[PDB]
Amino acid sequence: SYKSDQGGKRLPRIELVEIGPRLDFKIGRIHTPSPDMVTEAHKKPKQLEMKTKKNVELDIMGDKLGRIH
Amino acid sequence: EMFKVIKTGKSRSKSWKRMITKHTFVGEGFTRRPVKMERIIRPSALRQKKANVTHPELGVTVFLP
Amino acid sequence: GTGKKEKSRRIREGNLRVKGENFYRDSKRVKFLNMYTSGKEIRNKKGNLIRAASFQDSTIPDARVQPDRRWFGNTRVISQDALQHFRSALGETQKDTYQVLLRRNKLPMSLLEEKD
Amino acid sequence: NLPVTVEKPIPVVYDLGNLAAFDSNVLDKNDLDSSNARREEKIKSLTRDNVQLLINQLLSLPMKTTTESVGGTGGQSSVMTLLQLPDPTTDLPREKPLPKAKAMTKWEKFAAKKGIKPKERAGKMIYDEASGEWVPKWGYKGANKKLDDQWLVEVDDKVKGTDNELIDPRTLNRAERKRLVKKNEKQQRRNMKN
Amino acid sequence: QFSQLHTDRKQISVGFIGYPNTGKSSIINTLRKKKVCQVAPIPGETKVWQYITLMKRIFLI
RNA sequence: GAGAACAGAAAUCUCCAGUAGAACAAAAGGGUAAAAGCCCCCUUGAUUUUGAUUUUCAGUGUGAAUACAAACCAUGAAAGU
Numbered sequence: 001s002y003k004s005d006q007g008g009k010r011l012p013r014i015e016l017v018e019i020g021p022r023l024d025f026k027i028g029r030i031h032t033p034s035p036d037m038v039t040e041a042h043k044k045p046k047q048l049e050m051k052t053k054k055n056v057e058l059d060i061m062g063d064k065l066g067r068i069h
Numbered sequence: 070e071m072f073k074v075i076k077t078g079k080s081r082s083k084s085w086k087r088m089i090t091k092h093t094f095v096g097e098g099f100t101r102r103p104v105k106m107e108r109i110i111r112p113s114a115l116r117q118k119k120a121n122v123t124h125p126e127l128g129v130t131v132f133l134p
Numbered sequence: 135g136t137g138k139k140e141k142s143r144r145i146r147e148g149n150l151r152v153k154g155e156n157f158y159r160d161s162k163r164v165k166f167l168n169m170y171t172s173g174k175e176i177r178n179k180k181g182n183l184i185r186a187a188s189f190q191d192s193t194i195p196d197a198r199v200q201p202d203r204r205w206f207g208n209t210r211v212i213s214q215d216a217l218q219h220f221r222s223a224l225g226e227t228q229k230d231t232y233q234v235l236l237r238r239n240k241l242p243m244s245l246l247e248e249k250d
Numbered sequence: 251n252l253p254v255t256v257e258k259p260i261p262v263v264y265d266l267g268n269l270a271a272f273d274s275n276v277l278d279k280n281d282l283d284s285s286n287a288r289r290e291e292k293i294k295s296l297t298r299d300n301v302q303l304l305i306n307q308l309l310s311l312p313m314k315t316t317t318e319s320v321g322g323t324g325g326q327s328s329v330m331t332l333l334q335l336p337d338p339t340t341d342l343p344r345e346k347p348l349p350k351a352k353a354m355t356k357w358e359k360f361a362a363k364k365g366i367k368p369k370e371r372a373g374k375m376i377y378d379e380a381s382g383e384w385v386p387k388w389g390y391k392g393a394n395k396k397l398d399d400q401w402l403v404e405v406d407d408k409v410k411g412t413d414n415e416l417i418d419p420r421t422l423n424r425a426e427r428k429r430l431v432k433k434n435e436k437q438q439r440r441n442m443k444n
Numbered sequence: 445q446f447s448q449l450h451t452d453r454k455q456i457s458v459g460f461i462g463y464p465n466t467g468k469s470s471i472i473n474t475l476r477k478k479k480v481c482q483v484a485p486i487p488g489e490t491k492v493w494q495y496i497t498l499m500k501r502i503f504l505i
Numbered sequence: 506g507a508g509a510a511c512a513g514a515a516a517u518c519u520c521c522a523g524u525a526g527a528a529c530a531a532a533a534g535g536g537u538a539a540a541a542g543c544c545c546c547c548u549u550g551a552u553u554u555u556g557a558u559u560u561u562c563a564g565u566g567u568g569a570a571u572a573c574a575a576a577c578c579a580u581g582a583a584a585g586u
């Protein structure tokens with residue numbers, strides 16, 4: 001990183017120095033999963049996250065608030 | 070000693086309701102149960118929110134929630 | 135009718151079942167409805183106490199508090215960063231008339247309610 | 251004073267949770283083939299532009315500061331300012347499947363049917379009336395094994411008339427305890443089989 | 445809507461308060477579509493509280 | 506493998522060689538050697554307590570179990586576990 005003189009003191013100028021390794025991969029062979037395995041591997045736990053509920057929010061103070069229409 | 074029997078009915082024949090005679094702490098967001106389904110009674114005059122707490126160190130007493 | 139019998143109903147839909155459990159009531163329903171006639175004491179011919187009235191037992195309990203180091207530890211603490219966040223948030227709130235308070239968060243409001 | 255505003259025809263996308271930047275612009279085969287000696291310069295310039303864009307996004311991300319001093323748990327001190335990375339956008343397969351929900355055991359089904367609430371489990375210390383001490387109700391120096399150490403045991407009236415009269419009652423109670431423990435283990439194995 | 449916001453409470457109660465002769469009993473009768481609370485032009489007709497079941501989860505007082 | 510009164514096929518001490526052929530768990534087709542083996546020191550707290558969060562229950566709905574996280578706790582010079 002270097003001083004930029006045009007992005008202020010927040011956005012430095014970037015430079016890259018290669019350190020290796022440099023590699024060229026030719027794509028020889030493939031083997032793809034079955035779609036049920038794809039879905040099983042992309043399932044999410046959802047245990048940690050709070051359940052969403054309509055018209056119910058949490059404010060900055062942490063109070064649970066309900067909306068009335 | 071803890072509970073008092075509260076009789077209901079015109080002829081006072083039912084005796085399934087109980088009243089707590091000691092002081093209680095009910096907490097925040099307390100709402101009374103509907104009277105038909107209210108077995109345990111904690112009257113509002115006996116509910117407490119604060120106490121006089123004495124600290125052993127420094128020898129003071131403070132009124133705390 | 136054999137199909138209308140209580141035995142046949144259970145096939146369609148031993149010691150666990152209680153008295154009065156039928157098509158209309160489950161066990162919990164039976165006990166909740168028996169609450170309205172529960173509070174009576176039982177006495178025999180001689181006048182002894184077969185069973186005391188509900189919530190009217192006369193036995194004196196052994197009221198003791200055991201020694202434990204959980205009594206002497208801090209139960210609630212708040213960081214300086216959290217205090218600053220809640221102090222800033224108290225003041226930025228824009229109350230809407232159509233929002234109701236469902237549950238109030240437990241906070242040290244004595245430490246948060248500082249006004250110049 | 252080189253510029254820090256990389257302009258790109260096709261707008262690039264970011265996954266700041268994975269610290270990745272993806273550009274789908276046009277790449278020529280001639281400038282990237284091994285027959286070209288400037289392929290390294292072209293690739294370095296393209297990667298430099300993409301890294302500049304990614305660094306701009308990262309340094310424009312919100313920052314967290316704290317007031318706690320060093321030597322405390324947490325890892326962030328007062329002088330450290332930390333970027334708040336968002337959740338990763340790119341989806342990747344897991345290494346193991348999600349933990350299955352275990353089926354209810356026989357005790358759990360019976361407790362649900364009969365309305366038995368779980369015990370509060372405050373502690374393992376019970377008060378002993380015969381002494382003036384609190385003792386563990388089970389385990390190391392527990393109160394469930396005091397009959398073995400009891401100095402005097404009265405012989406039950408019902409044991410008489412059977413050949414098990416000569417047996418030490420402490421031995422009999424230890425055998426009953428071990429039988430109960432093995433019964434509990436067999437019930438656990440049965441639940442695991444079911 | 446209030447019942448849905450308190451769906452974990454198994455029932456909610458709505459208490460009608462206000463000045464005498466403002467129409468609390470009339471409003472409750474309107475909601476029930478039946479004369480379940482006594483109504484009069486003279487103030488002070490209602491003298492004690494009264495529970496009315498509007499729905500399975502909604503009570504009026 | 507050699508040396509040392511009782512003391513030899515088996516007691517205890519000393520030296521050299523010693524990839525683990527010992528002792529711990531799993532059933533490696535590559536587990537562990539300034540150890541994951543043996544001894545010593547510190548802790549007996551391990552069923553802590555907080556949660557607007559996950560699942561279940563309740564006529565006692567701001568409670569309890571339960572999952573997860575955090576604050577602590579133990580030890581160590583520390584990294585850290």
Ligand SMILES: Nc1nc2c(ncn2[C@@H]2O[C@H](COP(=O)(O)OP(=O)(O)OP(=O)(O)O)[C@@H](O)[C@H]2O)c(=O)[nH]1
Nearest residue numbers: 464465466467468469470483484485487488489490
């Ligand atoms: N025009 C008109 N009259 C109403 C309305 N609501 C109530 N009233 C009349 O106002 C009078 C008061 O009725 P109540 O229902 O007894 O009012 P309340 O508040 O319950 O009075 P109390 O029970 O005595 O405390 C009645 O005679 C009603 O007929 C309304 O919406 N419009």
Ligand SMILES: [K+]
Nearest residue numbers: 484486487489
């Ligand atoms: K009236």
Ligand SMILES: [Mg+2]
Nearest residue numbers: 468469489490
């Ligand atoms: Mg009225």
